[PDB]
């Protein structure tokens, strides 16, 4: 039981993949574990909230380094976790095996990115293949990607989403009402939610990143207002410092992933939000 | 099969071909334009070297069956049967002048939505006038396989594949069968439309003890290939219209190119299938890319 | 059923695609050759897998460890020439890896074979293989004929230096650098008259190869070849062409020279070194290339030990000393860093003196030095210069140094300098880390990367056990305590992570007293993450404690701990209880 | 003067030998350094206009210039330039020197010994492309005009290859090699001599098994391609050599194999098909049934290549047995709807081809 889930975590922790059926028991228990949270997944301060880890697992491992490991640390994810298959196959598992070991303790969201399409795109799903062979692995991660809450609500004064907000949806009661076991379609008020990105330009803007709908500062204003949210979190934008502060601070980015692609050389940076829900960044550089 | 190399016509693509001639003070030049359609935003098309704007004809086709608007397919000076006064002076900065004065000669008094695509030097082309901004109504700017840092790094290769066909060829058919055989045009009928223009009518193997030749030649080319690109990726983040790149490989991405698109500045899509031409080995695919485009800003209304 | 029924099978494993198949059988040949007859096995079984065998890599590497180990199968030494040919065709495949390990398997095998074998089939083998077309042949040759050679008689010992000559004369670089490499064996083989008369001219025609890689291998059989000869004959013979390799055009000769210079110095004895390898050395540190100053550098502690004692000092410090200050400023970080390793074990060679007049003051440029690893190193091996002279002169400079290395911007710089630490309080002493140092561990327990604290809560570890548990009680338990006080849940378990640590060092009545009033205090922490995590140190730290105490005030808690909304504190509560056999 | 120009020429020659290049401290010497740039530019514009300016004393100074510019060992390989443009010019001066027409081989082949072409060799392994571009043309134009030391430089290459694909695997150098090679090759005599098949078979193959085929495969292609159109019997070794060399856990090494491949049948006769169909489809079809979506794509477009489906056609009966397991197994199970298009249409010309 959870001596195989702490054999496991020990495994990759050795950066050692685990096997297929050990995947497939994950991602069932996962599921099952999934299918009891909703959509807008409620988390008590504190915790820490990471940007994109973009599938650098050693970069994982720094950021554990510098932030604590689990269960030690609550932590929060906004999502994005395949990426360019450098090592994504052993992050992803890590996560997952933290979240069935510890469901309290770690709070992961679904990026954008944790779809079938983008991930076979993104060679994640080319990962999958070169170090199983067999396509099983991807189709089980996939099917647990579809179980991912979409949002997270800090303490009930703070929300977070990998993207940023949608036309659609003025009020938390509605991305309740939504399902997230479904594929992410390019529309919808699910994909705005993931897609979107905040933008000086006031009001709802056509998002040039392909999906979603760029915001005005007013426009995350009046959404906190509305739902009385002190503040919002979102990554899926590089910050060079590691986080972003725009919309008269009412907007905050935060990126987890140091150097990404190993070429940029930009700063990751880690919010914590303490007992006293007061946020903090911690900023790393990429390990050796 | 497919043993057909009589050449289409450009009629099928295009329906009207003006030649609009336009006395500068350095002379008369003549630009050798096509425009189809009847009504919508402009699609002003740019080709790479060794290329024509008929290249584009077939993917021009792709088009009109996803969103109905104005067609321009413009060929560059030097290039194709396009006439030029100073066949010799090929700047940049003589380019944009150039297409700001074609734009000016198509209407100039009342400008259309007008949109860009550009391929090769021809994005960067694009991107040069974006900066310039003669065009008074701009919409969109999109380039394939068009970036500063790889274009320098990889001019060779793109020099080499070209000049991998004999320099020259006996007939029109020739050159599309040498096309249809090297596989480096998917669709026939794009050989066909593209040899036509890409041609004109009139390293070294190493031994042991008139037919159709190039239209361009690689030598100036390379000569002026570094001008061109010169801070090409700073000027396309500089551009303020929106931007969509396709590019068939996502690590191919310079590094201020990719944090440029991952900040969320532009959109990308990867085709791995696209090669050499990666305009016109999936012209259909990136046709539906570009409606999309159009679509979700708005810019052009679908059929 | 078949007489050929295991060859049966072997052919079939052969025309079967499954090479994992073919894997299995090669590995399973042993067993296979066990149950077979042994003339069976030599009658057919060895002329099928030298004849039909054309098998993937990593297979044939198999197949060549099995006929390695058939040592005992065939026979033993009596039959092992039938092995011969078998292996023989394993050393000519393309691979390397193969051959190099089929050449392996028949060095072992040469020493089974006696002297009339020996001479009779594995020499005429060695002939074959060097007069092969192929360079592989050659290549596989050249590990063969070192063990060829001592056992056969003398006239076929002729045969086979000449035959080595004709190899190292080939027009092939792969063959010269084999037989380069296989050099300084063959000549230990050789006796000494041939070995003046032969491997020198020999030695000298390969190092005066035009491809670099022959000279630097060249310089590499240099070392045996000086090893072999007696130290009068160094001078007029081996000495110049070392002479004109110290002095190649190319780099990489030069740093192999640098690289072996400390073996060359202690083959050649005591007086040569002086007189010629001193010079070399010199230009060597002086180099145009930075690697090869680097190489120099790394080599430059073992070459000032091994010098004569007598005059070592007077040496360093007229030839090498300015060098060595030369080479302290140099541009290129990694020269810098490689030097502050070795410069220092040149402390107790000099004496304190010496040290304080020139050494000193080079150590305190090399810990203004701006790059973090260079300072890393000579912080190191710091045991050399705190024996040679007094630890107030070292320390009064290196305190600056240690504050701003632990403040270092760059948490990697902090993490080195935390594990690096304990070894500076033991040199130290006790109140040079009271009067300061206290104050940056503090800083490091507070900071606020994980890795950091728990890099703390190691070096308090090591701290407590160097200078004793009554220290700590004094200091490091009120401080450690009131450091849980913090407001951020994450500082306040550090206190937990250290209580955890400290608890095996401590011992139990000092455990009893302080610490468990505080664990028991946070296990009513709002946190559940504080909470499992005082689960989790009573449970470490319960066999150290007393059995009363543990019924009394644990297993009430633990209880509580149980009974609560959280699933994880739950799990973990009820583990620890199972664990102490509370519960 | 031309005298006094050609006198001149040789006074610039020497300035520009001695320690005034970018090299040397920029600052000092600053107009010297200036001026030696401008002498090279000089040297090269004057070499180019003019005409008859070489002369037998003329070579032995370009030569040492050359070799004192540019043969040197090197430098250390620490990756995983302020003095380039003067080495440029160098490069660039001595390549015209060379197109001279003025230019006699038979003077200078006293000048240029096989020491020299050995010395420009290992200069291949420069990290900076547009060193080996040009070094890659120097020797291009070396091996043009020098008969005598074709076969050094023949084998001297080969000694290269043999040292990178069985000891060091570490060469920056072995695209251009590659493509002057190939250059050699489409001048190679109708009857191949021993030496060349010695060089196809023992040098090139192997190539395929090295790890970092990436860089240089199109290069190899070519040259394997060249060789296959020079003579049809080489073609069925070199196939399962290619079978044999085939990877077995690289994706993307199986799509720039089946690249290769697909030029090989695009050149390959039918009489050396019959042989080699068999191996060769049964990788194909485990390429096909491959979960990799690249390489079944390849695959696919495999049978969209007309010659291919010619070939196929010719003989049915041996292809078709192998080709219909990994087809329906693959009928049974697709993701992509591109995968899927395609390889239902591969059915349908599976069952056009014979039913």
Same mark, same amino acid.
């Given at each position: ?69 689990? !269960?030690? +640390? ?10 360019? @298959?450098?090592? /994504?196959?052993?992050?992803? %598992? $890590? ?53 991912? !809450?979409? +949002? ?10 990998? @993207?940023?907000? /949608?036309?659609?949806?003025? %009020? $938390? ?116 | ?25 350095t002379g ?21 070297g060794g ?26 000076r030097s290039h194709?049967?396009?006439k030029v006064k100073n066949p010799e002076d090929l700047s940049a900065?003589t ?26 030097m ?30 320098m790094?990889?001019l060779n290769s793109m020099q080499n594949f070209l000049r991998g066909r004999p320099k020259t060829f006996k ?28 041609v004109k009518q009139c390293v070294e193997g190493i031994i042991e003890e008139h037919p159709y030749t190039w239209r361009i030649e690689l030598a100036k080319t390379e000569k002026y290939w570094d001008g061109w690109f010169r ?73 | ?583 | 003067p031309p005298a006094d120009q050609e006198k001149l020429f040789i006074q610039k020659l020497r300035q520009c030998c001695v320690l005034f290049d970018f090299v040397s401290?920029p600052?000092?010497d600053l107009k010297w350094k200036e001026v030696k740039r401008a002498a090279l530019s000089e040297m090269v514009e004057y070499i180019t206009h003019n005409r008859n300016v070489i002369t037998e004393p003329i070579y032995p100074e370009v030569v040492h210039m050359f070799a004192v510019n540019m043969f040197r ?8 330039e302020a003095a380039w443009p003067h080495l440029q010019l160098v490069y660039e001066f001595f390549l015209r020197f060379l197109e001279s027409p003025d230019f006699q081989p038979n003077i200078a082949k006293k000048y240029i010994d096989q020491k020299f072409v050995l010395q420009l060799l290992e200069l291949f392994?420069s990290?900076d492309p547009r060193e080996r571009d040009f070094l890659k043309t120097t020797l291009h134009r070396i091996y043009g005009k020098f008969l005598g030391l074709r076969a050094y430089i023949r084998?001297q290459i ?15 150098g072995?695209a251009e090699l590659l493509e002057i090679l190939g250059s050699i090759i489409n001048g190679f005599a ?29 290069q ?136």
């Open positions: 039981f959870t001596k195989e889930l702490d054999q496991w975590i020990e495994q990759l922790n050795e950066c050692k993949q685990l096997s297929e059926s050990q995947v497939k028991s994950l991602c069932e228990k996962a599921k099952e574990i999934l299918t009891k949270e909703s959509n807008v997944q409620e988390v008590r301060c504190p915790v820490t909230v990471c940007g994109d880890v973009h599938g650098q697992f050693h970069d994982l491992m720094e950021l554990f380094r510098i932030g604590g490991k689990s !269960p030690d +640390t609550n932590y929060l994810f906004m999502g994005d976790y395949v990426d360019r @298959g450098y090592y /994504s196959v052993e992050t992803v %598992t $890590l996560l997952v095996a933290l979240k069935v070991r510890y469901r309290e303790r770690i709070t992961i969201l679904r990026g954008n990115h944790e779809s079938r399409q983008i991930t076979q795109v993104y060679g994640f799903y080319d990962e999958c293949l070169r170090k199983y062979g067999n396509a099983n692995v991807w189709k089980y991660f996939t099917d647990l990607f579809d179980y991912l !809450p979409l +949002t997270a609500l800090v303490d009930g004064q703070i929300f977070c989403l990998h @993207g940023g907000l /949608s036309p659609s949806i003025d %009020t $938390l009661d509605h991305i309740r009402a939504l399902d997230r076991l479904q594929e992410v379609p390019h529309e919808g008020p699910m994909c705005d939610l993931l897609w979107s990105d905040p933008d000086d330009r006031g009001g709802w803007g056509i998002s040039p990143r392909g999906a979603g709908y760029t915001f005005g500062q007013d426009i995350s204003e009046t959404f906190n207002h509305a739902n009385g949210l002190t503040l919002v979190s979102r990554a899926h934008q590089l910050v060079m410092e590691g986080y972003n502060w725009c919309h008269d601070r009412n907007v905050v980015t935060i990126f987890s992933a140091p150097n990404y692609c190993y070429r940029c050389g930009n700063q990751a940076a880690i919010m914590e939000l303490d007992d006293t829900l007061k946020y903090s960044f911690l900023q790393f550089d990429p390990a050796p | 099969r497919k043993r057909d190399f009589s050449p289409v016509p450009w009629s099928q693509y295009f329906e009207s071909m003006e030649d609009v001639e336009v006395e500068n003070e008369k030049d003549t630009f050798r334009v096509y425009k189809s359609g009847s009504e919508g935003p402009v699609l002003l098309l740019l080709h790479g290329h024509s704007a008929l290249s584009w004809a077939v993917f021009t086709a792709a088009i009109i069956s996803r969103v109905q608007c104005r067609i321009v397919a413009l060929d560059l194709g049967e396009t900065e380019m944009a002048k150039d297409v700001g004065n074609v734009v000016e000669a198509m209407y100039g008094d009342l400008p259309p939505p007008i949109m860009l695509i550009g391929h090769a021809g994005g960067a082309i694009a991107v040069h006038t974006a900066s310039s901004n003669l065009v008074p109504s701009l919409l969109g700017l999109c380039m394939i396989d068009v970036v500063e840092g790889t274009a790094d990889a007939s029109l058919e020739n050159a599309i069968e040498w096309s249809v055989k090297s596989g480096q045009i998917r669709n026939l009928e794009s050989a066909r439309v593209s040899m036509v223009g890409q801070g090409l990726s700073n000027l396309f983040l500089s551009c303020p219209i929106p931007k969509l790149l396709l590019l068939a490989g996502v690590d191919r991405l310079d590094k201020d190119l990719t944090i440029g698109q991952m900040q969320g500045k532009f959109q990308m899509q990867v085709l791995p299938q696209c090669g050499h031409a990666v305009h016109e080995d999936a012209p259909d695919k990136v046709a539906e890319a570009v409606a999309t485009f159009l679509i979700r800003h708005r810019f052009a209304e679908p059929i | 059923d078949d007489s050929l029924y295991p060859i049966a099978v072997l052919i079939d494993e052969l025309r079967n695609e499954d090479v994992q198949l073919r894997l299995n059988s090669i590995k399973k040949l042993s067993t296979i050759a066990l149950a077979l007859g042994v003339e069976r096995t030599r009658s057919e079984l060895l002329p099928f897998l030298t004849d039909t065998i054309y098998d993937e890599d990593e297979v044939l590497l198999a197949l060549a460890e099995q006929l390695g180990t058939f040592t005992t199968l065939v026979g033993g030494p009596e039959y092992v020439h039938c092995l011969l040919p078998p292996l023989e065709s394993l050393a000519t495949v393309e691979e390397t890896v193969v051959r190099d390990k089929a050449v392996e398997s028949l060095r072992a095998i040469s020493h089974e074979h006696s002297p009339s074998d020996l001479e009779a089939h594995f020499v005429p083998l060695v002939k074959r293989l060097a007069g092969g077309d192929w360079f592989t042949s050659r290549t596989s040759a050249c590990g063969l004929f070192s063990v060829c050679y001592p056992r056969v008689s003398s006239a076929v010992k002729a045969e086979l230096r000449q035959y080595f000559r004709n190899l190292c004369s080939d027009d092939t670089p792969m063959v010269r650098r084999a037989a380069a490499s296989k050099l300084g064996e063959f000549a230990k083989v050789l006796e000494l008259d041939n070995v003046k008369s032969e491997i020198i001219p020999m030695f000298s025609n390969l190092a005066s190869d035009e491809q670099d890689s022959v000279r630097l291998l060249a310089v590499e059989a240099c070392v045996n070849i000086a090893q072999l000869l007696p130290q009068e004959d160094l001078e007029a013979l081996v000495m110049p062409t070392l002479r004109q390799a110290a002095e190649d055009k190319s780099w990489r000769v030069r740093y192999m020279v640098a690289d072996k210079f400390t073996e060359l110095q202690k083959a050649v004895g005591p007086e040569i070194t002086k007189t010629d390898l001193v010079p070399a050395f010199q230009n060597l540190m002086k180099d145009c290339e930075a690697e090869v100053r680097a190489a120099a550098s790394h080599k430059v502690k073992e070459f000032c030990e091994n010098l004569s004692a007598d005059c070592r000092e007077n040496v360093i410090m007229s030839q090498i000393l300015p060098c060595i200050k030369e080479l302290v400023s140099d541009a290129n970080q990694h020269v810098k860093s490689a030097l502050a390793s070795v410069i220092m074990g040149l402390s107790p060679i000099l004496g304190k003196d010496n040290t304080i007049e020139h050494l000193l003051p080079l150590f305190l440029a090399q810990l203004k030095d701006e790059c973090p690893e260079v300072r890393l190193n000579i912080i190191s091996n710091l045991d050399c210069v705190n024996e040679v002279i007094g630890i107030r002169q070292l320390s009064q400079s290196l305190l600056p140094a240690i504050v701003e290395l632990a403040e270092d911007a760059k948490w990697r710089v902090r993490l080195a300098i935390i594990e690096y630490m304990p070894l500076l309080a033991g040199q130290l002493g006790v109140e040079f880390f009271d009067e300061k140092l206290n104050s940056l561990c503090m800083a490091w327990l507070v900071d606020h990367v994980y890795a950091i604290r728990e890099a703390a809560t190691s070096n308090l570890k090591k701290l407590v056990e160097k200078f004793g548990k009554e220290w700590a009680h004094a200091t490091i338990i009120p401080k450690v305590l009131a450091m849980s006080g913090d407001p951020n849940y994450l500082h306040r378990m550090t206190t937990l992570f250290c209580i955890n640590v400290l608890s095996e060092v401590c011992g139990q009545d000092i455990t009893t007293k302080h610490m468990l009033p505080t664990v028991l205090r946070m296990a009513g922490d709002p946190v559940a993450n504080v909470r499992f995590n005082v689960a989790k140190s009573l449970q470490k730290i319960g066999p150290i404690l007393d059995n009363s105490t543990l019924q009394s005030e644990v297993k009430p808690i633990l209880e509580k701990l149980t009974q609560d909304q959280d699933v994880d504190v739950k799990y973990f509560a009820q583990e620890a209880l199972t664990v102490l056999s509370l519960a | 401290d600052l000092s060992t090197l430098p250390p390989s620490s990756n995983p392994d990290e084998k080969n000694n290269i290859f043999y040292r990178f694909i069985y000891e060091t695997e570490h060469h920056n072995i109708l009857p191949l001599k021993e030496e060349h098949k010695i060089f196809l078979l023992k040098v090139l193959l192997p190539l395929h098994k090295v790890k970092s085929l990436s860089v240089y495969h199109p190899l292609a070519y040259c394997v391609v060249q060789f296959l159109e020079k003579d049809s019997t080489l073609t069925e070794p070199v196939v399962m050599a290619l079978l044999k060399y085939w990877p077995k856990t690289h994706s993307p090494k199986e799509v720039m194999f089946l690249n290769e491949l697909e030029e090989i049948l695009d050149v390959i006769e039918p009489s050396e098909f019959v042989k080699i169909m068999e191996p060769l489809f049964r990788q194909l079809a485990k390429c096909v049934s491959s979960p990799h979506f690249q390489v079944a794509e390849r695959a696919l477009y495999y049978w969209n290549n007309e010659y291919i489906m010619s070939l196929i056609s010719d003989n049915a009966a041996k292809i078709l047995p192998i080709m219909f397991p990994s087809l329906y197994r693959n009928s049974k199970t697709h993701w992509n709807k591109t995968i899927h298009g395609l390889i239902y249409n591969a059915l349908k010309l599976f069952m056009e081809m014979n039913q």
